[PDB]
Amino acid sequence: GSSGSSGMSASVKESLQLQLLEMEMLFSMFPNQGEVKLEDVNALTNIKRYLEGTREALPPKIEFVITLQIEEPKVKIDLQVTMPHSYPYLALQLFGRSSELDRHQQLLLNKGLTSYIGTFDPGELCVCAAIQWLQDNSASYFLNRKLVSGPSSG
């Protein structure tokens, strides 16, 4: 239908739509099967149904974890991406932590990221940029002054 007046707002329908399309893009950038871990492969379906209007019940958002295959330093950083019924419109929530990384370090990384993603316009994807961002700015953080190198004996 339609009303007489209306301020500024968007219908979840669209949001979800952009949340499903981005999936096809992410899968492409990730050829490895052990990359994108979807809590449930049916998380995308339930949604497609809501778009029709048959399912009045709000479907489960698209939440998963993407592994950052850092080329150098050759390390792994588990990235927990969560796209609610708002994003991209809303600032999604990400979590970057690795066994190597430390408490102080993480903070710096996460912070630097959150801001980067918080500088995007409500309409386009952001998680697609968070991946590259981290990679390019992944070692910059690790790089630290610590005496670990040393000889060995028997």
Task: Establish if 148 belongs to a structural domain.
Answer: no
Task: Establish if 149 belongs to a structural domain.
Answer: no
Closest CA to 59 of 122, 1, 15, 8: 15
Task: Establish if 99 belongs to a structural domain.
Answer: yes
**Cα 145 from Cα 143, distance rounded (Å):** 7
Structure tokens at 54: 């048959």
| Number of Cα atoms under 13 Å in the Cβ half of residue 62 | 25
Q: What distance lies between CA 136 and its chain's CA centroid?
A: 16
Q: Which residues contact 71 (CB under 8 A, 6 or more apart)?
A: 135
**CATH number assigned to the domain comprising residue 100:** 3.10.110.10
Structure letter (DSSP) for residue 55:
-
Task: Establish if 96 belongs to a structural domain.
Answer: yes
Task: Provide the sign of the torsion angle of the four alpha carbons 21, 23, 27, 30, taken in this order.
Answer: positive
What phi and psi values does residue 77 have, to the nearest 5 degrees? -125, 105
138 near 152, Cβ under 8 Å? Answer: no
Q: Which residues contact 72 (CB under 8 A, 6 or more apart)?
A: 139
Max CA-CA distance within the chain? 83
Task: Establish if 73 belongs to a structural domain.
Answer: yes
**Cα 24 from Cα 17, distance rounded (Å):** 12
- Technique of determination: NMR
**Where in the sequence is the domain holding 127, given as residue range(s)?**
11-143
Q: Which residue has the tokens 């005496």?
A: 147
H/E segment holding residue 37: strand 36-38
Number of structural domains found in the chain: 1
Task: Establish if 63 belongs to a structural domain.
Answer: yes
**Cα 19 from Cα 29, distance rounded (Å):** 16
C-alpha distance from residue 58 to each of 29, 44, 47, 125 (Å): 29, 12, 8, 21
Task: Establish if 5 belongs to a structural domain.
Answer: no
Task: Establish if 120 belongs to a structural domain.
Answer: yes
